[PDB]
Amino acid sequence: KKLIAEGPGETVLVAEEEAARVALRKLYGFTENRRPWNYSKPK
Amino acid sequence: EKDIIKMLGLEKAHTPQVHKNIPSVNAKLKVVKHLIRIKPLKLPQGLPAEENMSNTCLKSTGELVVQWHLKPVEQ
Amino acid sequence: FREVVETQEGKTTIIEGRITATPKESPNPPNPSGQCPICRWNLKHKYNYDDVLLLSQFIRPHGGMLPRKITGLCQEEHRKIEECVKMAHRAGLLPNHRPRLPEGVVPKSKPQLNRYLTRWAPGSVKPIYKKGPRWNRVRMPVGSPLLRDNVCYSRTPWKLYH
Amino acid sequence: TYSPLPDDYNCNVELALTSDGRTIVCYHPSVDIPYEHTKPIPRPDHDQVLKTRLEEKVEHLEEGPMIEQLSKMFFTTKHRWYPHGRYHRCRKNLNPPKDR
Amino acid sequence: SYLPGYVPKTSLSSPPWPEVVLPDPVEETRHHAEVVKKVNEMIVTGQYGRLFAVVHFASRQWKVTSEDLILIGNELDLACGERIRLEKVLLVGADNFTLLGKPLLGKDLVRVEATVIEKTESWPRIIMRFRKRKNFKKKRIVTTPQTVLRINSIEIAPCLL
Amino acid sequence: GSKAVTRHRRVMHFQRQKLMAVTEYIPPKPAIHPSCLP
Amino acid sequence: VKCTKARYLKKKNMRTLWINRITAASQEHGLKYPALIGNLVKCQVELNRKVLADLAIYEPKTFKSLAALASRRRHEGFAAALGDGKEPEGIFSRVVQYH
Amino acid sequence: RGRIPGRQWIGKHRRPRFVSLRAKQNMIRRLEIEAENHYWLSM
Amino acid sequence: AGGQWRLQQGLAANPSGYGPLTELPDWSYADGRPAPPMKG
Amino acid sequence: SSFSRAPQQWATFARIWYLLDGKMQPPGKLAAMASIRLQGLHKPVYHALSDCGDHVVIMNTRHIAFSGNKWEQKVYSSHTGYPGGFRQVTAAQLHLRDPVAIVKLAIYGMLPKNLHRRTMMERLHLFPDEYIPEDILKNLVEELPQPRKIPKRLDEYTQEEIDAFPRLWTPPEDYRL
Amino acid sequence: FKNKTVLKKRCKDCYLVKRRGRWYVYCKTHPRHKQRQM
Ligand code: FES
Ligand SMILES: [K+]
Ligand SMILES: [Mg+2]
Ligand SMILES: [Mg+2]
Ligand SMILES: [Zn+2]
């Protein structure tokens, strides 16, 4: 009873599959808003 | 009226110009008093000197300040 | 208040009058120096046509206005309340102050049109068939000019002509 | 208990100023939907001797009836459904730019 | 005993809007310090992902994030590949917090860097004037210098006190 | 054009119309209507 | 000639679009457009309408914070106007001076 | 119906122009500026 | 918007006028060196 | 939001269904609310060519209320195009003939005067009574607040409210009333 | 009923009444006194 992910869709089946993808992105650290890749010269 | 605006250097609108507060100048200003805004120049820190000529700013209050740091006030 | 009963007994009519319970003004008005009920309670400019609690105190059981000599209102306030009651009746906010109907009279079914802030009597107003130019537009009055001085909480003043 | 806006729909806004007073700090964490406020997904949708067959009742409609059906289905006017001429069809860019 | 200004409840006795009671300034100053400390700790511990910022550059404001491109409508007098800092940051935002300048954020708080990646010219812009019946017609073509900048990084430091 | 004196009320220049509007008599309003006081 | 004069309308229309979009976003938070723009200025927030419209679409949490800030400054104005000068200036009403 | 004879804003019979609230406020705003101009020209 | 309010605080009616938003340098070299002064 | 591109686009541009209750409400205020929603002007992503308008369902249109004497004074004018075809009917007459016409006409006049208008009108669903088709009822998302607060009748006031309002004057005991 | 811009009572029995949105002069003694507001 705790929300892990939410997904939109044009059908309940499509929405559910998208919600699973959203959950996987969060679990693996590939969220759209993740820290960008650091291209700065190594220290 | 067109002619006096040119004489006073007021061709460009919203551009402050400084003029001497003397009868002759006032006589011109009165002809075009309906076209202009007149405010007194205030010198809170006195007249600019040679050292601070390049660091002056005319504020909207009419005060000509002789230091312009572009910094917040520590106070 | 005073009631009157007409009882016919033994082919004889006896007209009597009895004094019923009379309501009393609430104690300690906030403005004792007021010269009328309205300004004694700081209500001037602060009531509208829908304030039936206020309006209902100055009307008869059948919806008619009470005399100014009895209520004690000033001419200005009496006229404001009088117009407000007309608008309250027309809006349907006084369903228990309907006109007295003689025995055997049942009004026919009439079309129900919800309305409010009605200055004029519906039957006395004509259609605006010709609106006129923008610079001479015939307007539809809304509300009453008597209430023009009412407290305005918006920056736009009350529009009385639509 | 003062809140400038209701906090129950989008995020919980907390406004603060730094000690110097030169920066406005806005802490706005997301509000998750409560489980109680959700519905269950509607998963729920003989001796036949003959194999069941999938029959496509295409029932091709006429232009008028077809356009009426489409206009009602998508709540549009009929006009969008009518064809366009070659002049307009051939002006359309079939390889338009794509921003991202 | 009714108060001197008591008005019986009517539709116009009081204003339509609800009454608002603002927090006690002393109590709120303490709450503000707590909020700032919480957000500062998020910066120290790196509890933020991608950042965006609103930067004033070339007279206008740009909402930018890392890996972005912006087209400056003038020449910047910088060689291609040169890295620069954008010093006028009005806003820096994260998923869970946003910092607002008054009007500009301190240079210690946020650092936005960018790289010149192209110096070019705009496509030709037609300037034509025409007045009917006056033999009045003139055509001019102008190309305006442009500079493309790539936003390399938006970095924030734990300097909220 | 029309003469300075006409049989009808001549239309005013808009600037003069505005001048008249801005210079209308405003009567003194008392804080409390005098009929509401002893 | 049309292409030349259209440069004026592009700027005009662009700004009408931002105001419409900002108005929509403000109404979602119970604020009218003039209250947001006016009160943000009084907080020394110089965000322009182009950025504000972009924030409404792509940064809705930040925009609610900006709407909340404007609303807070708006309420402080009312309290000050109601007061007779006894009250100190609101916390968000204090202006940072630059000399 | 509702024609204005001839041209609208010239001649004997004209379209009536009315003074709006903001038109009044605009004039008063400039009257205040000129009133102050009088003062600063007095010394 | 806000022109009258800014004037009341001693600021330019237009925020494009004098002040740090306009006059301060737009950019500097990533290594620290200051940029040449802006033409405006 | 970390949504795939197509679901993300679908969500932003989706059509919301709104319910509006017209009982005791002036049609103009109803129309003003419906016009914004039908156009999409309540969305920050609004654009004229985005076709992002929503559905508006207005019920109880038979019970709309005009202020003043608009029932008697307001006239709706039409022309059949034939000689002598000019027709003028009052709002009261039109309302009894067509219980949705008044709200429909108020909305139609407020929408932009362009080719999108009739498309927007297809997304407007007017019902004269509380009855709404089951399909329309199942798709509703949010009900909009009524623009006009309905004033209470004197018979609807609780005795607490009546007691709270002071008696303002003392009638003479010997008045018949 | 004769249309009149200015309504005047012509005898003691004349009585002014406002009906259907306009003023009327009614007289039972002399029905010729009846006037309608124009
Ligand atoms: S005496 Fe005060 S309003 Fe009548
Ligand atoms: K003319
Ligand atoms: Mg002449
Ligand atoms: Mg003509
Ligand atoms: Zn007579």
CSV table of N, CA and C in Angstrom, one decimal, chain B residues 25-54:
chain,number,residue,atom,x,y,z
B,25,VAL,N,16.2,80.3,-18.0
B,25,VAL,CA,15.9,78.9,-18.3
B,25,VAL,C,14.4,78.6,-17.9
B,26,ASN,N,14.0,79.1,-16.7
B,26,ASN,CA,12.6,78.8,-16.3
B,26,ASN,C,11.6,79.4,-17.3
B,27,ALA,N,12.0,80.5,-17.9
B,27,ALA,CA,11.1,81.1,-18.9
B,27,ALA,C,10.8,80.2,-20.0
B,28,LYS,N,11.9,79.5,-20.5
B,28,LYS,CA,11.7,78.4,-21.5
B,28,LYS,C,10.9,77.3,-21.0
B,29,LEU,N,11.2,76.8,-19.8
B,29,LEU,CA,10.5,75.7,-19.2
B,29,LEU,C,9.0,75.9,-19.1
B,30,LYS,N,8.7,77.1,-18.8
B,30,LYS,CA,7.2,77.4,-18.6
B,30,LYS,C,6.4,77.3,-19.9
B,31,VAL,N,7.1,77.6,-21.0
B,31,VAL,CA,6.3,77.5,-22.3
B,31,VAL,C,6.0,76.0,-22.5
B,32,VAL,N,6.9,75.1,-22.1
B,32,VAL,CA,6.7,73.7,-22.4
B,32,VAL,C,6.5,72.9,-21.1
B,33,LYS,N,5.9,73.5,-20.1
B,33,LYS,CA,5.7,72.9,-18.8
B,33,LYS,C,4.7,71.7,-18.9
B,34,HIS,N,3.8,71.8,-19.9
B,34,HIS,CA,2.9,70.7,-20.1
B,34,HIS,C,3.4,69.5,-20.8
B,35,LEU,N,4.7,69.6,-21.3
B,35,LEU,CA,5.3,68.5,-22.0
B,35,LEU,C,6.4,67.8,-21.3
B,36,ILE,N,6.7,68.2,-20.1
B,36,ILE,CA,7.9,67.8,-19.4
B,36,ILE,C,7.6,67.5,-17.9
B,37,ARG,N,8.5,66.8,-17.2
B,37,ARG,CA,8.5,66.7,-15.8
B,37,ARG,C,9.7,67.3,-15.2
B,38,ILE,N,9.5,68.2,-14.2
B,38,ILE,CA,10.6,68.9,-13.6
B,38,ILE,C,10.8,68.4,-12.2
B,39,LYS,N,12.0,68.0,-11.9
B,39,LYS,CA,12.4,67.6,-10.5
B,39,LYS,C,13.7,68.2,-10.1
B,40,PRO,N,13.9,68.5,-8.8
B,40,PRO,CA,15.2,69.0,-8.4
B,40,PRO,C,16.3,68.0,-8.3
B,41,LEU,N,17.5,68.3,-8.8
B,41,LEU,CA,18.7,67.5,-8.7
B,41,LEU,C,19.1,67.5,-7.2
B,42,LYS,N,19.2,66.4,-6.6
B,42,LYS,CA,19.7,66.3,-5.2
B,42,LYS,C,21.1,65.6,-5.2
B,43,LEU,N,21.9,66.2,-4.3
B,43,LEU,CA,23.3,65.8,-4.2
B,43,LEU,C,23.6,65.3,-2.8
B,44,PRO,N,23.2,64.1,-2.4
B,44,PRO,CA,23.3,63.6,-1.0
B,44,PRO,C,24.8,63.5,-0.6
B,45,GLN,N,25.7,63.2,-1.5
B,45,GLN,CA,27.1,63.2,-1.1
B,45,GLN,C,27.9,64.3,-1.8
B,46,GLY,N,27.3,65.4,-2.1
B,46,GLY,CA,27.9,66.5,-2.7
B,46,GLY,C,28.2,66.3,-4.2
B,47,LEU,N,28.9,67.3,-4.8
B,47,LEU,CA,29.2,67.3,-6.2
B,47,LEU,C,30.2,66.2,-6.5
B,48,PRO,N,30.1,65.6,-7.7
B,48,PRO,CA,31.2,64.7,-8.2
B,48,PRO,C,32.5,65.4,-8.3
B,49,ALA,N,33.6,64.7,-7.9
B,49,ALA,CA,34.9,65.1,-8.1
B,49,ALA,C,35.6,64.4,-9.2
B,50,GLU,N,36.9,64.8,-9.5
B,50,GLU,CA,37.6,64.2,-10.6
B,50,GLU,C,37.8,62.7,-10.3
B,51,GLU,N,38.0,62.3,-9.1
B,51,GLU,CA,38.2,60.9,-8.8
B,51,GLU,C,37.0,60.0,-9.0
B,52,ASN,N,35.8,60.5,-8.8
B,52,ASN,CA,34.6,59.8,-8.9
B,52,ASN,C,33.7,60.2,-10.0
B,53,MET,N,34.3,60.9,-11.0
B,53,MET,CA,33.5,61.3,-12.2
B,53,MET,C,32.9,60.1,-12.9
B,54,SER,N,33.6,59.0,-12.9
B,54,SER,CA,33.2,57.8,-13.7
B,54,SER,C,32.4,56.8,-12.9
